[PDB]
Design a protein around this nucleic acid. Structure first.
Lengths: 48, 49
DNA sequence: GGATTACACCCAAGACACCAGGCACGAG
RNA sequence: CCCGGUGUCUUGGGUG
DNA sequence: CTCGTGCCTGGTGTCTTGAATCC
């Protein structure tokens, strides 16, 4: 939940995200590309 | 005084450490967002470790 | 290959580059 | 018309 | 009136090779 990775405001309104929030975005993006890649254009090396 | 006292001028220097720059007390106060525990530091009304 | 170098407090000074797109300005 | 709070990560020098 | 050219902004993003001794 957000309790573990709270947002912080560097200067005024501006807010950056916790390292886990950015890293979960990367896992989530990478998860979507496996969806599309498994179905088509997967001649072993691409999947690898 | 029954004893005599060594007495005379000496050069003394005033150092930066003054008590009103160090004194600190906390009852209740601000907490960290992440741990919900008292913050660190005199300048933030913090609590002792 | 990893494992560590006692505990506590305060001060000051820094935080993301590169390329494609639109919009505004100047000239013919 | 009550309640009402603001920062995270490092570097350098000290104090004991 | 219409085309050439510079500035602001957002989505995107990675690599020319260059301290010591206990279990």
């Amino acid at each position: 939940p957000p309790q573990v990775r709270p947002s912080i405001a560097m200067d005024e309104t501006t807010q950056g995200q916790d390292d886990l929030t950015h890293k979960l975005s990367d896992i989530l993006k990478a998860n979507i590309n496996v969806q599309k890649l498994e179905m088509d254009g997967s001649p072993q090396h691409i999947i690898n | 005084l029954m004893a005599q006292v060594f007495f005379g001028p000496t050069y003394y220097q005033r150092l930066r450490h003054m008590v009103d720059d160090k004194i600190h007390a906390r009852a209740r106060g601000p907490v960290q967002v992440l741990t919900r525990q008292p913050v660190e530091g005199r300048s933030r009304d913090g609590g002792l470790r």
